[PDB]
Ligand binder design. Sequence first.
Ligand SMILES: O=C(O)c1ccccc1SCc1ccc(Cl)c(Cl)c1
Length: 289
Amino acid sequence: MEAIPVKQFVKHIGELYSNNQHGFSEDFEEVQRCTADMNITAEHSNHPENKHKNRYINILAYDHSRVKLRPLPSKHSDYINANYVDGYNKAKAYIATQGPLKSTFEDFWRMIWEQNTGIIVMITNLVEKGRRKCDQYWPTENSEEYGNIIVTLKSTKIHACYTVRRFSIRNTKVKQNERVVIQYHYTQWPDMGVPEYALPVLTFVRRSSAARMPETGPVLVHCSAGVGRTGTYIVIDSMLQQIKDKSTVNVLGFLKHIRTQRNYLVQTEEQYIFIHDALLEAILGKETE
Ligand SMILES: O=C(O)c1ccccc1SCc1ccc(Cl)c(Cl)c1
């Protein structure tokens, strides 16, 4: 299980697809098993005081990697369902977290402030197929207040497949001190089935990733549970970095690694395949533009 040279990778993808994606299934089953001999504690996620702070009862934040909120003058005011996740050759390049609940909006923005996060990647619509996926944690227009954090919508650009909102946030208890936070929001989600083409996602990963500023906190990435699409984004982005750096790809190895940092990152085989399609589009896209 070593890195694959980028020039062999698309051929590798052919092989994984063949015979009704038998190879993909092997890979992903291996991913899902890669935790079998690992007990990873999530005591805080399971504490009675924090239960209401978890969007899904089965989706937890591993203790060792969990993002800690600075405590408040409550023993469990430190908790949010969120984990640091490695990027390519970079520890804690991301915070992967659930779509925030109304009840955790203040925690959410406090984390962004405390972690010096400058970019949000939102990979879900608030509602999908009639179902509630995420609560709106930003102002529709002008300003909204969440605890000591006041968020102001400055500008929006609505593209075909995603939306960029530029906020300025201010901490009232500081002096206030103001930061730019940009939210990249992928908006194109089919009423039936799942997204079919990787190219628009590739473009979205490229632009939202290039927006990262030195030297800032980790990029915040969420969907609904903050594992499936969230994991998918992180692997694609990271592998694009590896390709740029070393002209090699290691999807299976990298994914098994980050699976120790938040449960279920890249949740389905179809997402796993999608990662490969995006990288394929990046590889084939070069040398032929
Ligand atoms: O949405 C899913 O669960 C799904 C199921 C099968 C195949 C692909 C997907 S999600 C595809 C996707 C869309 C937007 C972004 Cl930004 C990223 Cl990173 C990945």
